[PDB]
Amino acid sequence: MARIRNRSSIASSGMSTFYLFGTPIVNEEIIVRNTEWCSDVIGNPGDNPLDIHKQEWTIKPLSGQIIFGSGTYRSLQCPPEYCRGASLSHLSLPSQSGLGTTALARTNPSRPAFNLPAFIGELRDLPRMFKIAGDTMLRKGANAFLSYQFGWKPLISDISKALDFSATVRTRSDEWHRLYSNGGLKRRINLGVDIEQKKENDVVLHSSNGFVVASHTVITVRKTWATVRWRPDAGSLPPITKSSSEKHARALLGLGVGGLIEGAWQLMPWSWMVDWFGNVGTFLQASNNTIGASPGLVNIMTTTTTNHQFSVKRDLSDGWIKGGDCSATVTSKARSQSSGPTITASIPNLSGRQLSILGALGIQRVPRHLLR
């Protein structure tokens, strides 16, 4: 729901009196009324526009007195009556154009990715290689594949490397799935700062108990920035399988060659490895080492502020009048929403050391037909 709220604070107040016949004929009051009003939206989880209009004052009260026959007038600690209007506005500034499009164009995180190795095609086939090799060697002893400089130790080294790769890909998948949450990836850009100054002259500060004129100077500042959140498109995420079987497999491998010679090898988690290797292989080949993404809405925030400072001009005032310096500040803030044409980006998944783990696994030197 959209609500409009108004709120105010008292800045200063004072008293001014005129005596005649020894009587206070007029003793009128003066108030400074700090004012601000805001608009905001609540009850909707989605980001909403909002804006603020806000103003304050800072006044050094007048002082002094003058005497006449049976009558006087005095403005001690009396803030100037000029503040009763307090109407102020920001200075004109150059207009911005097409901020949303530029932000969307510059913010795109698509960038090239690491090249996919050739063995990723065979990635799905690793488990039966190892199973059949171990089974044949156990059936016919270790003498097998001595012609190829192969044995128990190379096999265990290769399977350990595969488990390392599996855990690394698992952790990376966990990280991607965490990223899908909490609104996706956020980025920020800056859209410049505009500063302008001017001068003003002959500002009447008081119209009773004499007259007061003061100089005027104005300062204006504007900022502008934009933010967007890039989130992976649903369904493009990698497999997110949890993994405690690898701990068990590593525990078995610690038994050494002697353990695997015993009934230990029949405890390998072949089915899990086959399923997950096939899933990851088909996913990697489906994509190209990348996750897709789409942009959410684009927002722009533009704060604007100005200062209005005065200095009392003493050449057009009654001699008894002293002081009267004052300053004012006006601030505004805004939040607004925009959207652009559909865009899709690609972000690398794994790079270098991630994919290089098993690029030279030793079992590849045996002909396939013996295994196949």
């Binding site: 960038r111 090239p112 090249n115 996919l116 190795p117």
Partner: protein, 122 residues
């Protein structure tokens, strides 16, 4: 300078027009990139000046590179196609005749000459 995008018309005049995006910038270097379903386009600009020597000539080298790579398909791995040009001259040289030499080199190269060159015809 260099805009937010670098336009490239592969195939010479009248070809298909692509528009790379500004993606990185540092130390007089900037680079443009664009992703595509079967390939990608890469374009970077670099500048460099050599250090000062007691008695030698101070030279400056520009470089511009286009790079094109296609993703793997089946058993065929990935491969990349690129071509870059450099220019070298002293710090205080006359710019206009350098531009003339650059025009000469650009004009000499044409599709026919590229065809002859790739055939290892020396």
């Amino acid at each position: 300078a260099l805009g937010d995008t670098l336009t490239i018309t592969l195939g010479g005049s009248g070809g298909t027009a692509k528009v790379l995006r500004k993606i990185n910038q540092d130390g007089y270097t900037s680079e443009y990139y664009l992703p595509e379903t079967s390939s990608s386009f890469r374009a970077k600009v670099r500048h460099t000046k050599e250090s000062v020597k007691p008695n030698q000539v101070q030279y400056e080298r520009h470089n511009v590179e286009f790079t094109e790579t296609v993703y793997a398909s089946g058993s065929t791995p990935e491969f990349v196609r690129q071509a870059y040009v450099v220019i070298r001259h002293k710090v205080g040289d006359v710019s206009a005749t350098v531009s003339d030499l650059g025009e000469a080199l650009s004009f000499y190269l044409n599709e026919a000459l590229y065809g002859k060159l790739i055939g290892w015809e020396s």
